[PDB]
Design a protein around this ligand. Structure first.
Ligand SMILES: *Cc1cc2c(cc1C)nc1c(=O)[nH]c(=O)nc-1n2C[C@H](O)[C@H](O)[C@H](O)COP(=O)(O)OP(=O)(O)OC[C@H]1O[C@@H](n2cnc3c(N)ncnc32)[C@H](O)[C@@H]1O
Ligand SMILES: *Cc1cc2c(cc1C)nc1c(=O)[nH]c(=O)nc-1n2C[C@H](O)[C@H](O)[C@H](O)COP(=O)(O)OP(=O)(O)OC[C@H]1O[C@@H](n2cnc3c(N)ncnc32)[C@H](O)[C@@H]1O
Ligand SMILES: O=C(/[C]=[C]/C1=[C][C]=C2O=[C]OC2=[C]1)C1=[C][C]=[C]C(C(F)(F)F)=[C]1
Ligand SMILES: O=C(/[C]=[C]/C1=[C][C]=C2O=[C]OC2=[C]1)C1=[C][C]=[C]C(C(F)(F)F)=[C]1
Ligand SMILES: CCCCCCCCCCCC[N+](C)(C)CCCS(=O)(=O)O
Ligand SMILES: CCCCCCCCCCCC[N+](C)(C)CCCS(=O)(=O)O
Lengths: 500, 495
């Protein structure tokens, strides 16, 4: 066997952050990575037509201070996603340009319903502890409904229900009927709430890394040298003896004091355990699927949309639209003009049947209509990745919880199993599902092992992160009217009382 | 490498039934079984205290002609589950004895509501094709709601909603909010409907095998001999070369022309595939959990409940009861007297933390209350099995589909992947979830390979089964009033 202190299973950002912390603390680490590359759900493609493109995780923003600190220490820099010109909301076959993070509503009744929808998502979120969502006072009631059921109760207008549906589909690459309401409300609150999660400027989609996010995992592999073993899918973990034994598919055995599992929870099923996992984890890892998304980047000669005072952001409602959301993906130098779009949830399954050329044609026709621009029919290059086909991801962006699962099984997501500790973005408490959460979880799992070894005290396991000096976070604020305007049923109760 | 015609992954009833059919046709088969035993979600324990006890699947009944025929060929006999005396429905802390399969209602409004609930489950089932539930005319609408949401819509009384809840929990060992309404309605319809699935006499729980259901898998292993490889968990399947390569955790390599996957769909995740699975199967096998149950058998000196004209069936409402449903587990001679109970769904998760002795005390005190007998407090033995803990099952009885999954991914369950064909009870079209479905699916997957080999024509892949002579089915009937009484909102529209 190859002997070390800690085997890290998985060389995504989470495993690589865990391994780096352990290596920096003076332990002997090995990373066992299934693929011929590091980065996992991040993947930066390089070729002469695109220079570089993120086909996986890409965006970082204010309050994501751990990924910003890690990337900065590795010599990386960010740039701002283009949001100079107008956003577009495309609904019922027409485009409505706007500014500010939320598409505006003019109809007074529709305005109360929209305002109440976002307000109520955050009001419910404030009842949910980030580190223990199952402790919310109505956890059971909220976990036993889908997001579809919650929207049917909350939204008194079709306008608000349709926009809320797109919000769920885009945030968690799943249908409203697929996901627990408790879990979704937790997921949004642990990113800092509705405004922070949806925003480009001042939110999650503010920035990208110059040269691609895959550099985070690659530059850590460079620091670790031959400690990263590529094409070593882990098949077996045996904790019955004094040291843990970890076996790979390519017939190698690693011996360690502790293991960090840094893979999506359900991909733990690809490992045979001796002794068997405890009942709750054994069943949990069959109950937690990942979402479905194709990330598609269409290249153009020039960022022509900016000449029409459009930034490239399109929020597109409607079953026929393949893509519900786009961002400008033009390089910071202004060249390699491109539109990034997501094909979400059922559409990632429905349109996976088409050829690459057929998907490009449908996307160009959609963009031509939404942008009112024949130039959108003149692409120069196309790249795409359907994350649903990845054996060693299971989907993207992250793991969702169907109704009933988070209250029954969520307590064991990051509960150690003897000498196995659990990393991966799914186990984070702040920007779980993101590159930020991957760093939080990898460093927390590593510190749990440092504590087990008597190297640090228990109060150093969870560590706060200083605010980025490069990416300052503007606070989330509301107006008096946003806070106190009635809901639709609130207004009807007021009318009822006046008339009585 | 060990060379054969077909490798069957899994030595449950489905894999054993598939391997027996291929063997009988003259092919060289190997069965690779992860555990140190065969039988999978069937497990018969033998000891002097119980003689034998089914800790997994046990019951068979009319219309399950394939498991009855296979068991009869292997030399097995059935006996009837005791239903001579009265059933009990325990409601709001009191026992109400009854006869007939459905617990009766006396309040006129509650009566209409209960009648409508069962009738409506079967009306909806008649629009769901057994072999393609995703082709139901309302497939998306019904797949996008949980059973909890359907029961909220349908049930005007708490009485009906709570008994419907017990029905779901008992049939599919899952909460109403965990499961798709389309999938659950399919599940009931593909067992022959509400009457057939809930009934002991003339239904799914009519009979047990003399000596235990484990003998089905054990006696096929006896026939196959050293073709069955125990403690061979499959870790890797490679389809890139002329022959399929199957690798096990204990470092053995098998080469075959074809493979049958006879494991629960989600346990496909324990295998690394080269080339990778197609996208839809890759995601499907992450979306299909199994239910949660503890099967508990309390032994007594005598079947003392029979003296009070109770058969031992208990239907026990409410959150506090650990067990919602029991059957008499006494042997056909009246000895090894016992009550079988299930701890279902969230209760299996909640009560798993207790000791075996703590569960025994809770069950005995519940049974004393429900049977109104102090005799229930004097057990002579106890056996139990928590199926949630099994690495190579994932739970029991079967796989459930959460909302949205059956319409998006259902078509992929039995779609071959190059030279891998899919067996397992989850792929059956009649009593999927049962030992009957295990036999149907194993034999169908085996005949798909015989067709691939040019040995049989396409029309022989799916084969009908003659009715058992020993366990004939009687018709399910309804009354004029059951068919035509209004629903509660129906009685209101007339007002
Ligand atoms: C895919 C995707 C993700 C994504 C996104 C868009 C798409 C299309 N948008 C994001 C964004 O703009 N900003 C952001 O912060 N996140 C975004 N996401 C999510 C993000 O990519 C993920 O949250 C993050 O990358 C997850 O990191 P983590 O380290 O937790 O997980 P991983 O990347 O999946 O890495 C796991 C590794 O383990 C290997 N593996 C899997 N099984 C095994 C076995 N058995 N043995 C050994 N290694 C294994 C995987 O190959 C992977 O490298
Ligand atoms: C558990 C249970 C099941 C059950 C029930 C009560 C309980 C507590 N009551 C039933 C009843 O009264 N009547 C009835 O007809 N069914 C009842 N059920 C369900 C029934 O037991 C199942 O439907 C049936 O046994 C399923 O058979 P099938 O052959 O489809 O599946 P299996 O038994 O799970 O067998 C799978 C085998 O595969 C092995 N395995 C798993 N992974 C691997 C790997 N990687 N490699 C090799 N082998 C593998 C398993 O160990 C198993 O033997
Ligand atoms: O929810 C939104 C974006 C979420 C988002 C967008 C990209 C992501 O990449 C990984 O996680 C991601 C989350 C959103 C953006 C603009 C407008 C709206 C609104 F308001 F619903 F229209 C929602
Ligand atoms: O649904 C019922 C039984 C199902 C059943 C009982 C045992 C089983 O073992 C494997 O599948 C099984 C299914 C049932 C039986 C009597 C009454 C009721 C009722 F009516 F809901 F209470 C339900
Ligand atoms: C009069 C009925 C209008 C239904 C409106 N919706 C939004 C559908 C339901 C409100 C639910 S709740 O009534 O607020 O609980
Ligand atoms: C009263 N419940 C049964 C709650 C709703 C009736 C369902 S509906 O009004 O027919 O949708």
């Amino acid at each position: 066997s190859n002997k070390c202190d800690v085997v890290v299973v998985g060389g995504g950002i989470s495993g690589m952050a865990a391994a780096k912390l352990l290596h920096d603390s003076g332990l002997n680490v090995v990373v066992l990575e299934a693929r011929d590359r590091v980065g996992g759900r991040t993947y930066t493609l390089r070729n002469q037509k695109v220079k570089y493109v993120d086909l996986g995780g890409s965006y970082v923003g204010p309050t994501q201070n751990r990924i910003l600190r890690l990337a900065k220490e590795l010599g990386l820099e960010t740039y701002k996603v283009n949001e100079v010109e107008r956003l577009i909301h495309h609904v019922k076959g027409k485009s409505y340009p706007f500014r500010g993070p939320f598409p505006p509503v003019w109809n007074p009744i529709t305005y109360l319903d929209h305002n109440n929808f976002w307000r109520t998502m955050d009001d419910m979120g404030r009842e949910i502890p980030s580190d223990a969502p199952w402790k919310a006072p109505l956890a059971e009631e909220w976990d036993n409904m889908t997001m579809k059921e919650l929207l049917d109760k909350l939204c008194w207008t079709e306008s608000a229900k349709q926009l809320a549906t797109l919000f769920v589909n885009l945030c968690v690459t799943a249908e409203t009927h697929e996901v627990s309401a408790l879990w979704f409300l937790w997921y949004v609150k642990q990113c800092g709430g509705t405004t922070r999660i949806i925003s480009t400027t001042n939110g999650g989609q503010e920035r990208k890394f110059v040269g691609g996010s895959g550099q985070v995992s690659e530059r850590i592999m460079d620091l670790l040298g031959d400690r990263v073993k590529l094409e070593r899918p882990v098949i077996y973990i045996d904790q019955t003896r004094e040291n843990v034994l970890v076996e790979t598919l390519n017939h190698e055995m690693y011996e360690a004091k502790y293991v960090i599992s840094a893979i999506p929870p359900t991909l733990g099923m690809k490992i045979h355990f001796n002794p068997p996992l405890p009942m709750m984890r054994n069943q949990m890892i069959t109950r937690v699927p990942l979402g479905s998304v194709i990330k598609c980047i269409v290249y153009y000669k020039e960022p022509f949309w900016r000449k029409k005072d459009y930034c490239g952001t399109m929020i597109i409602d409607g079953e026929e639209a393949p893509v519900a959301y786009t961002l400008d993906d033009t390089k910071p130098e202004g060249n390699y003009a491109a539109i990034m779009g997501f094909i979400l949830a059922h559409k990632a399954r429905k349109l996976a049947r088409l050829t690459k050329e057929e998907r490009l044609k449908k996307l160009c026709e959609l963009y031509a209509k939404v942008l009112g621009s024949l130039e959108a029919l003149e692409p120069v290059h196309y790249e795409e990745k359907n994350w649903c086909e990845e054996q060693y991801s299971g989907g993207c962006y992250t793991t969702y919880f169907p109704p009933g699962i988070l209250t029954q099984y969520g307590r064991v997501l990051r509960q150690p199993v003897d000498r196995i500790y659990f990393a991966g973005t799914e186990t984070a408490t702040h920007w779980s599902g993101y590159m930020e959460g991957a760093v939080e979880a990898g460093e927390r799992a590593a510190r749990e092992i440092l504590h087990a070894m008597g190297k640090i005290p228990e109060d150093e396991i969870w560590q706060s992160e200083p605010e980025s000096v490069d990416v300052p976070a503007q606070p989330i604020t509301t107006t008096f009217l946003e806070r106190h305007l009635p809901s639709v049923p609130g207004l009807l109760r007021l009318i009822g009382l006046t008339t009585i």
